[PDB]
Amino acid sequence: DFQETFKTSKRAYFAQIEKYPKLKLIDTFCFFLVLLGVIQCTFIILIRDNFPFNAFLAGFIICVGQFVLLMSLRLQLCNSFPGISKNRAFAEFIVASLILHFVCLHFI
Amino acid sequence: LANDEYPRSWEISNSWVYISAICGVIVAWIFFVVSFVTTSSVG
Amino acid sequence: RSCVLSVFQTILKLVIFVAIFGAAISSRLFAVIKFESIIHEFDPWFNYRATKYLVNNSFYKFLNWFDDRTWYPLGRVTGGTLYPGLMTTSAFIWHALRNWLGLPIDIRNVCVLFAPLFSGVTAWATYEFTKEIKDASAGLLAAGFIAIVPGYISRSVAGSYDNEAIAITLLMVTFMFWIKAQKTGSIMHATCAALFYFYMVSAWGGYVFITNLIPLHVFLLILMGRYSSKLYSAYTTWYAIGTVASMQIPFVGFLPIRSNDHMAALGVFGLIQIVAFGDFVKGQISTAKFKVIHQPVSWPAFFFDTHFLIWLFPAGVFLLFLDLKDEHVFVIAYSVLCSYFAGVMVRLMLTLTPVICVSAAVALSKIFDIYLDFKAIKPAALLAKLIVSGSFIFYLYLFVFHSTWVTRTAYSSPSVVLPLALIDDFREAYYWLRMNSDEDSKVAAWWDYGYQIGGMADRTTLVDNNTWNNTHIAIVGKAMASPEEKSYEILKEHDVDYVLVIFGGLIGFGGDDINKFLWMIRISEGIWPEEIKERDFYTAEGEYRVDARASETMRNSLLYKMSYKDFPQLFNGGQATDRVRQQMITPLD
Amino acid sequence: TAVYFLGFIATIVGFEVIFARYYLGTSIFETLFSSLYLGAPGLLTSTKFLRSFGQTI
Amino acid sequence: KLMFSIISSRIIWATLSTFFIICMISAYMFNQIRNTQLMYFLPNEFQHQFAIETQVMVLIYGTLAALVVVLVKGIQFLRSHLYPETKKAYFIDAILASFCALFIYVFFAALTTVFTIKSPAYPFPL
Amino acid sequence: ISDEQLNSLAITFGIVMMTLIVIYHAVDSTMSPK
Ligand SMILES: CCCCCCCCCCCCCC(=O)O[C@H](COC(=O)CCCCCCCCCC)COP(=O)(O)OCC[N+](C)(C)C
Ligand SMILES: CCCCCCCCCCCCCC(=O)O[C@H](COC(=O)CCCCCCCCCC)COP(=O)(O)OCC[N+](C)(C)C
Ligand SMILES: CCCCCCCCCCCCCC(=O)O[C@H](COC(=O)CCCCCCCCCC)COP(=O)(O)OCC[N+](C)(C)C
Ligand SMILES: CCCCCCCCCCCCCC(=O)O[C@H](COC(=O)CCCCCCCCCC)COP(=O)(O)OCC[N+](C)(C)C
Ligand SMILES: CCCCCCCCCCCCCC(=O)O[C@H](COC(=O)CCCCCCCCCC)COP(=O)(O)OCC[N+](C)(C)C
Numbered sequence: 033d034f035q036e037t038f039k040t041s042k043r044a045y046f047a048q049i050e051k052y053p054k055l056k057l058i059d060t061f062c063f064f065l066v067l068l069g070v071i072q073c074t075f076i077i078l079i080r081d082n083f084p085f086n087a088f089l090a091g092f093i094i095c096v097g098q099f100v101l102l103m104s105l106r107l108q109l110c111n112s113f114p115g116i117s118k119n120r121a122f123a124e125f126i127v128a129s130l131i132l133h134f135v136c137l138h139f140i
Numbered sequence: 141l142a143n144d145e146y147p148r149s150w151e152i153s154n155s156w157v158y159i160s161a162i163c164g165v166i167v168a169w170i171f172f173v174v175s176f177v178t179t180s181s182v183g
Numbered sequence: 184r185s186c187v188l189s190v191f192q193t194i195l196k197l198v199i200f201v202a203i204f205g206a207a208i209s210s211r212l213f214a215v216i217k218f219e220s221i222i223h224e225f226d227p228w229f230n231y232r233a234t235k236y237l238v239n240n241s242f243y244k245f246l247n248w249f250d251d252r253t254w255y256p257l258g259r260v261t262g263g264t265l266y267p268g269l270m271t272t273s274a275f276i277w278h279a280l281r282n283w284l285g286l287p288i289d290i291r292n293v294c295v296l297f298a299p300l301f302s303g304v305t306a307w308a309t310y311e312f313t314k315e316i317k318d319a320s321a322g323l324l325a326a327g328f329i330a331i332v333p334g335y336i337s338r339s340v341a342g343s344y345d346n347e348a349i350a351i352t353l354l355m356v357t358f359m360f361w362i363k364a365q366k367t368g369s370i371m372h373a374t375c376a377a378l379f380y381f382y383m384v385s386a387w388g389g390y391v392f393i394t395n396l397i398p399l400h401v402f403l404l405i406l407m408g409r410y411s412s413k414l415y416s417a418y419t420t421w422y423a424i425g426t427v428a429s430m431q432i433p434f435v436g437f438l439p440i441r442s443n444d445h446m447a448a449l450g451v452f453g454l455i456q457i458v459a460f461g462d463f464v465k466g467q468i469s470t471a472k473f474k475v476i477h478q479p480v481s482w483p484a485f486f487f488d489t490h491f492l493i494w495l496f497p498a499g500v501f502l503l504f505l506d507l508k509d510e511h512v513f514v515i516a517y518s519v520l521c522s523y524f525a526g527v528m529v530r531l532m533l534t535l536t537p538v539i540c541v542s543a544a545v546a547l548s549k550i551f552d553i554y555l556d557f558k559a560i561k562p563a564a565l566l567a568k569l570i571v572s573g574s575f576i577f578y579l580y581l582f583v584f585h586s587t588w589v590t591r592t593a594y595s596s597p598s599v600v601l602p603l604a605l606i607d608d609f610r611e612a613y614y615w616l617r618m619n620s621d622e623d624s625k626v627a628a629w630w631d632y633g634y635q636i637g638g639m640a641d642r643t644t645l646v647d648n649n650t651w652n653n654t655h656i657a658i659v660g661k662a663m664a665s666p667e668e669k670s671y672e673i674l675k676e677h678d679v680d681y682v683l684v685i686f687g688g689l690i691g692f693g694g695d696d697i698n699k700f701l702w703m704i705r706i707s708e709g710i711w712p713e714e715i716k717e718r719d720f721y722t723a724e725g726e727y728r729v730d731a732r733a734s735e736t737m738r739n740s741l742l743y744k745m746s747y748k749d750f751p752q753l754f755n756g757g758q759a760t761d762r763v764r765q766q767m768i769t770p771l772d
Numbered sequence: 773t774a775v776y777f778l779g780f781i782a783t784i785v786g787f788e789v790i791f792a793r794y795y796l797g798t799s800i801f802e803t804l805f806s807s808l809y810l811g812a813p814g815l816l817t818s819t820k821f822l823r824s825f826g827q828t829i
Numbered sequence: 830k831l832m833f834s835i836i837s838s839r840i841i842w843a844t845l846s847t848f849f850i851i852c853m854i855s856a857y858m859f860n861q862i863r864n865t866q867l868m869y870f871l872p873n874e875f876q877h878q879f880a881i882e883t884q885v886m887v888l889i890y891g892t893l894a895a896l897v898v899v900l901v902k903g904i905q906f907l908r909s910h911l912y913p914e915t916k917k918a919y920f921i922d923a924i925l926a927s928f929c930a931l932f933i934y935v936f937f938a939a940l941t942t943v944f945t946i947k948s949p950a951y952p953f954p955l
Numbered sequence: 956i957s958d959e960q961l962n963s964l965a966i967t968f969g970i971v972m973m974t975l976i977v978i979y980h981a982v983d984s985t986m987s988p989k
């Protein structure tokens with residue numbers, strides 16, 4: 033069961049990546065936005081200390097929220113929403129990705 | 141104490157890691173956006 | 184033809200908004216042209232004391248402001264104990280009228296007339312919120328109700344300067360911007376909904392409801408199976424921008440992380456993340472996807488506050504419920520949840536009326552869509568249409584007469600002046616104390632009148648209406664209950680110069696300080712049990728009275744001697760009536 | 773339409789420089805007024821670039 | 830088979846939800862916290878009532894809600910389950926709709942009469 | 956200003972705002988698809 037769904041999903045995903053040269057750029061950005069959050073929590077687990085807690089929480093929020101806006105751009109960029117073009121999803125990505133950096137520079 | 145008279149985030153040397161985990165996402169983001177409108181589709 | 188009809192619709196809507204922006208303004212103003220124009224109650228005299236500080240020095244000296252004229256041996260720090268947003272939009276309107284439009288007016292007149300000016304924005308926002316569920320013919324009707332209905336006139340009359348005026352508008356604008364981005368799917372409307380959620384989390388303390396009303400919408404929207412790619416983009420940007428914008432306000436600093444109330448939202452976000460991956464696997468296989476996947480209110484307050492909108496409110500939810508067009512679950516989920524909480528509290532009737540108006544202005548629009556849509560000429564059909572439409576237009580005019588009757592009778596009266604003649608003896612003795620006393624001098628009264636003495640007499644009290652440190656009120660109530668020889672020392676440790684006592688035994692005030700004398704004793708039993716006991720203020724066989732057969736330790740207390748001091752020498756013959764307790768006092772007592 | 777692209781990079785880099793300069797020591801109203809004077813021509817120019825380039829995105 | 834048609838039909842959720850709003854807008858909750866007695870409702874006081882009076886309120890509000898929903902998404906079903914075979918059936922719609930309007934007026938007059946018995950000096954009845 | 960004139964101004968604005976709604980909804984119901 034899971035072998036068939038596994039190899040089916042690997043092949044049907046890798047063909048989709050090799051078709052469009054926009055998708056591997058998104059996913060290459062995404063994976064290293066996961067590794068930033070992982071080692072940034074590893075600093076907390078390594079030495080037991082919790083003192084500048086807001087400065088901990090700001091970078092972690094940058095990693096998670098910045099991951100999510102990429103996944104929304106990917107979902108909206110493969111299949112188009114009814115009424116929204118592909119020139120407007122990108123501008124909304126710029127504006128809403130540009131508010132979040134300011135409110136995570138005030139917070140540290 | 142006021143809200144301005146506090147040791148800043150430079151001077152603590154416990155939160156250099158997080159400032160270095162903000163600057164990377166900023167410059168990686170601008171190199172993302174410049175390298176997105178100067179490329180092709182299914183060339 | 185299309186230009187003619189469209190121009191007719193536009194001009195007629197302009198005249199509608201010019202009328203319904205004016206009916207609200209004229210309904211709020213009975214207490215301003217009847218009397219003078221002053222701030223009304225206990226709680227709105229701190230806000231006016233804080234927006235008069237911001238307005239004549241900088242904004243930097245207001246965010247971190249330590250005042251030493253309240254809770255005197257240990258003053259309070261304001262910036263981490265109040266909600267800014269009611270003050271700073273008011274200083275913004277003051278700064279815009281003074282410098283740009285050209286006309287300078289006082290800060291007191293901006294503070295009095297802050298609710299009636301602002302209610303027209305609530306009327307427009309309810310128009311726009313109803314334009315999404317139903318076509319734009321019902322939005323004018325829902326906007327026509329909410330500028331009249333007297334469950335909402337009760338909390339914003341001209342003079343009230345409390346937090347709910349800004350709050351019940353920003354609630355509506357946030358729900359409008361969420362209901363746009365539930366249907367369309369775009370990111371930018373969820374960003375704007377996050378920013379008005381930030382501007383609503385800072386003005387008002389019941390922001391918890393809008394935080395726990397959105398994940399109940401999404402969570403009921405998954406169990407029916409209406410999941411799409413519109414929810415992954417509309418929910419998660421609202422949570423990502425809105426949460427970290429919520430943590431910027433101190434007094435709610437790290438509370439959306441540790442606290443129980445915000446847990447549901449976090450859980451829903453995680454749940455949404457999982458189901459987005461379990462939808463990609465479904466597109467590949469077909470077989471094994473089955474293997475994987477407070478006081479209770481009485482009855483007539485409800486008819487009293489809304490006339491016949493409470494009458495056809497449970498018809499609009501049925502007629503609304505036979506459609507299920509993916510944004511009706513918002514209103515159906517709001518209505519049950521809010522109607523349960525507005526039946527065990529008194530003061531959650533304010534969050535209930537923006538759905539009595541909407542759901543009471545949908546069913547009536549669906550009634551009007553067929554009984555005055557004549558388009559065939561027959562006698563009997565036009566008879567039926569004519570008498571049904573006449574039947575409802577009659578009740579709607581009687582709704583206007585009812586609402587403006589009940590505004591001017593019950594909900595229009597000041598607490599500062601007490602009316603065949605006037606009784607103004609509650610502002611003599613604050614202005615005495617402002618004129619004829621040295622400027623650093625402490626007043627010790629009971630905590631109900633803390634805000635008015637600081638606001639209107641301008642001295643440095645010991646307690647006020649906040650009840651922040653609760654073992655300080657017990658010191659003051661221990662002072663007003665002991666004998667004289669010890670209350671002198673307890674009051675002298677804190678450097679109190681003046682003490683003051685209210686008293687209503689002469690004209691029957693009722694809320695005097697003998698009626699509130701019992702609760703004081705109970706607050707002083709949680710700490711010093713040995714010194715004071717409430718088994719001693721009762722007479723033989725347990726009756727509370729003030730007469731010539733009172734207790735031996737009631738007659739020697741410090742709040743008895745200070746109220747009935749020269750009261751028997753006043754009346755003729757040497758006898759007196761108490762006029763509230765209805766008891767008789769002799770000058771040996 | 774290379775000069776319009778030149779007017780598209782400079783407003784995003786311009787919206788990062790005023791955030792860094794906000795982080796160092798400046799107050800709010802200088803950040804907000806600088807964000808307005810930079811804010812409007814970059815809106816008009818960037819909108820006309822995304823309209824002009826268009827179909828290959 | 831059958832339980833999936835029960836959990837899938839929206840009519841029982843309609844009647845259950847509207848029955849919940851109806852039985853809770855007549856101050857059922859106040860009665861449950863502060864227990865009272867149970868001739869009729871307690872006159873001239875504005876904040877107290879007995880226990881049988883909320884039954885009368887539930888009957889009233891449910892009745893006129895039923896009159897309104899039968900007035901809007903109604904009259905087609907009754908004729909269909911009734912006689913169609915007479916003539917041009919517009920007259921059944923006419924007198925049927927008119928009698929529904931008159932029943933709305935009668936029960937609304939009953940409600941205003943009871944509220945003037947509860948709290949007098951109310952300037953307009955009926 | 957005596958509040959008798961404020962009373963008549965209040966019901967006057969209520970009736971003038973509340974009558975035009977019905978003719979707006981009658982024009983919009985009769986001469987429109989929905
Ligand atoms: C898409 C993004 C949209 C962003 C929308 C931003 C809209 C905010 C516009 C605010 C304009 C303020 C203009 C202003 O300076 O008025 C001031 C100060 O007036 C005030 O007190 C209120 C302004 C407080 C600003 C709150 C922080 C910024 C919140 C929005 C980012 C008058 O207050 P005053 O009390 O008279 O003195 C303030 C201090 N001085 C230095 C000026 C002496
Ligand atoms: C160029 C475009 C200009 C548009 C903006 C125009 C602004 C409208 C008026 C602003 C507020 C004025 C209201 C006001 O201050 O009057 C109040 C109370 O008097 C009243 O009766 C209240 C009248 C308010 C009705 C209009 C409210 C509209 C809401 C704000 C626009 C009485 O003031 P007093 O406090 O009594 O001042 C003393 C007056 N003596 C004569 C005793 C000296
Ligand atoms: C999904 C359904 C369940 C939802 C679960 C959500 C609830 C758990 C959320 C994480 C834990 C929250 C509790 C928490 O963080 O408490 C912290 C101190 O507590 C800590 O010890 C820090 C915990 C941080 C987690 C670090 C390990 C995480 C590893 C992830 C890979 C409070 O620290 P404070 O003492 O308040 O810091 C204040 C500092 N001042 C200077 C401001 C005074
Ligand atoms: C019409 C009026 C609208 C009222 C909204 C409510 C306004 C009050 C909320 C403020 C909450 C207190 C925040 C606070 O204490 O800090 C204020 C900083 O003050 C701020 O600007 C708060 C910013 C909060 C984030 C804004 C998110 C919106 C996104 C805008 C693009 C002080 O800023 P400053 O100290 O003046 O700037 C120096 C900061 N350095 C980092 C450079 C040192
Ligand atoms: C707590 C206060 C708030 C409570 C809210 C009260 C309930 C209001 C919202 C639910 C009412 C409508 C439910 C409904 O009609 O949908 C159920 C689909 O429903 C189901 O199959 C299972 C029931 C799940 C909905 C109720 C969940 C209980 C509440 C959990 C907290 C089945 O109808 P459907 O036929 O699926 O809807 C149309 C879709 N078809 C294409 C299939 C025709």
Ligand SMILES: *[C@@H]1O[C@H](CO)[C@@H](O[C@@H]2O[C@H](CO)[C@@H](O[C@@H]3O[C@H](CO)[C@@H](O)[C@H](O)[C@@H]3O)[C@H](O)[C@H]2NC(C)=O)[C@H](O)[C@H]1NC(C)=O
Nearest residue numbers: 613614615616617618619620621622623638639640641642
């Ligand atoms: C009401 O009117 C009086 C009378 O003018 C005003 O009093 C003025 O101000 C102070 C009291 O606030 C008077 O006494 C002075 O006190 C200062 C303390 O710093 C002291 O240094 C002086 O030597 C003097 O004793 C002052 O005589 C008086 N008149 C002036 C300044 O011309 C009062 O301000 C008015 N307003 C109120 C009470 O709100």
